[PDB]
Design a protein around this nucleic acid. Structure first.
Length: 51
RNA sequence: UGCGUAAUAGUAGCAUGAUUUAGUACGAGAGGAACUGUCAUGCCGGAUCACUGGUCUGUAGGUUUAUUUGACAAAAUAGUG
């Protein structure tokens, strides 16, 4: 009876994210959290913007 | 003289809470209203003294200090002792 998305979701930006949607809507939003591996994105974190 | 009018002017009541609605509506939950009804309350005003309190030259009674009038008596003065 279920419909599935396999969309990626950063570990940091979920901080009680799966807990909210589950309670708000049980059955019509049942997030099963399963790790895979760390995706690399084009961005360079560094302290102080120079020039 | 009475009984009246009423131009002109002034003019007064305002504000809350509890409950009823309703743990309702609303909201995934967290929470959480209103119209309406009732009982009250804050300040504002206009009166009144039945109660309660206040006051006392009612110099109304009661008590007592000092002095005076021989004593008791019953009074006086002490600016209402």
């Amino acid at each position: 009876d279920m419909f599935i998305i396999k969309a990626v979701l950063p570990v940091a930006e979920s901080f009680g994210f799966a807990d909210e949607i589950r309670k708000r809507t049980s059955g019509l939003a049942s997030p099963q959290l399963v790790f895979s591996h760390w995706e690399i994105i084009p961005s360079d974190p560094f302290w102080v913007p120079t020039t």
